[PDB]
Amino acid sequence: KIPRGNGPYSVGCTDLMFDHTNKGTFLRLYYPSQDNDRLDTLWIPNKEYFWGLSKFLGTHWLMGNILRLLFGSMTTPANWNSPLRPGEKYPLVVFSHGLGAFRTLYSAIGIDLASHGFIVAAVEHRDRSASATYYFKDQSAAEIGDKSWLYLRTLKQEEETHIRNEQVRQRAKECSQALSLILDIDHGKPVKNALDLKFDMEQLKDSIDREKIAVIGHSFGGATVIQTLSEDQRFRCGIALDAWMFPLGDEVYSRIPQPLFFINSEYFQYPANIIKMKKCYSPDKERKMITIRGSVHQNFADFTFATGKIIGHMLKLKGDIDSNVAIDLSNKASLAFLQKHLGLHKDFDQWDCLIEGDDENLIPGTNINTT
Numbered sequence: 455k456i457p458r459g460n461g462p463y464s465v466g467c468t469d470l471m472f473d474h475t476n477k478g479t480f481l482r483l484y485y486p487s488q489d490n491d492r493l494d495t496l497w498i499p500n501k502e503y504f505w506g507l508s509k510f511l512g513t514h515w516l517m518g519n520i521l522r523l524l525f526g527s528m529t530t531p532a533n534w535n536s537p538l539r540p541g542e543k544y545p546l547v548v549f550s551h552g553l554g555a556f557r558t559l560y561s562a563i564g565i566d567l568a569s570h571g572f573i574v575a576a577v578e579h580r581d582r583s584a585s586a587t588y589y590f591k592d593q594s595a596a597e598i599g600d601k602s603w604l605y606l607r608t609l610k611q612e613e614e615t616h617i618r619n620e621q622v623r624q625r626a627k628e629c630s631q632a633l634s635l636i637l638d639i640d641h642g643k644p645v646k647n648a649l650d651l652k653f654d655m656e657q658l659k660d661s662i663d664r665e666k667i668a669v670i671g672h673s674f675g676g677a678t679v680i681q682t683l684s685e686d687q688r689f690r691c692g693i694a695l696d697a698w699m700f701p702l703g704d705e706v707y708s709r710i711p712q713p714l715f716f717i718n719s720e721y722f723q724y725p726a727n728i729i730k731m732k733k734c735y736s737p738d739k740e741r742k743m744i745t746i747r748g749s750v751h752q753n754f755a756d757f758t759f760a761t762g763k764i765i766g767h768m769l770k771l772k773g774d775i776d777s778n779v780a781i782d783l784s785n786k787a788s789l790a791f792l793q794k795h796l797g798l799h800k801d802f803d804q805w806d807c808l809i810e811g812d813d814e815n816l817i818p819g820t821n822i823n824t825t
């Protein structure tokens with residue numbers, strides 16, 4: 455089971471695609487909900503995501519059918535299409551997924567943030583970094599629900615530097631576009647969701663605390679945080695969860711005026727990656743870094759909750775640390791950082807000491823030695 459949120463608000467979930475094209479926005483929204491008696495949200499909602507996962511894992515696409523048998527009915531504890539909780543403006547997080555992932559795979563994070571009074575927009579990237587994604591070729595195809603699928607691109611070693619950089623820039627543009635979509639919905643701009651879902655987007659009018667915007671992401675999504683900050687000042691701070699720094703251009707490092715928090719796993723990180731994080735530092739800039747003891751790269755994603763301990767440790771989905779323990783530290787330290795740099799009037803400063811890595815399961819800074 456994916457954990458329920460720790461905060462006082464019930465959580466709703468819906469999907470939004472606007473426009474319907476491969477250049478439109480596609481996001482999964484998590485939000486404080488009025489009601490708590492809706493059906494739970496289906497975790498991986500289409501067979502083609504399992505096909506995509508199988509391709510990303512380097513197996514026959516019939517392994518996709520096996521993944522679908524094992525995981526196709528799994529839900530996540532968010533109330534599907536629940537009405538938005540009225541009478542309060544919510545801060546906004548835009549969330550960026552890792553390589554081989556897609557919008558639905560970081561619900562443990564999105565649900566927890568929503569349970570504390572955030573609206574969370576988990577973008578699905580169309581840069582061919584997702585295992586799978588879909589869109590509609592035109593207006594007619596969207597009407598009848600005729601989906602065109604786009605699968606993960608495999609690169610030759612010669613393509614690595616250039617294509618990863620083109621992708622992180624598209625990813626940043628996609629984060630900015632998702633922000634502008636939500637801000638126009640907050641105004642009251644009519645938007646026809648290309649998905650025919652029973653969630654009226656009119657509810658989101660006057661619901662966003664328009665100054666209180668952050669960008670969060672894991673791995674490739676962590677590089678997306680940094681690219682997005684350097685290009686879009688509407689984002690006030692960023693949290694990079696075990697960032698994979700390789701995609702970033704040389705130019706970005708000196709160009710991030712916003713506060714930036716690095717939350718790392720113990721076992722993923724390596725000197726070339728840490729050196730790149732340290733290039734983001736300057737005396738005039740707010741930077742924090744903590745490492746979760748006993749954690750692996752996939753501790754930030756929902757697949758850490760999808761299996762048992764033995765199989766989990768084997769497939770590097772789990773580390774030596776308990777998965778609920780690790781995600782609680784990452785989510786609580788995130789909340790304290792967001793309260794500080796968004797200026798929230800909540801009680802998230804109870805976790806200020808986790809920003810400094812002051813906990814038995816935290817390392818301040820990094821365990822990685824560089825030069």
Ligand SMILES: O=C(c1cccc(F)c1)N1CC=CC1
Nearest residue numbers: 507510553554555752757769
């Ligand atoms: O690490 C995994 C993963 C998921 C299931 C089984 C597995 F062996 C590995 N991910 C899939 C998408 C992104 C990362």
Ligand SMILES: [Cl-]
Nearest residue numbers: 721722750751
């Ligand atoms: Cl790892």
Ligand SMILES: [Cl-]
Nearest residue numbers: 724725726727
């Ligand atoms: Cl290295």
Ligand SMILES: [Mg+2]
Nearest residue numbers: 630685686687
């Ligand atoms: Mg911009």
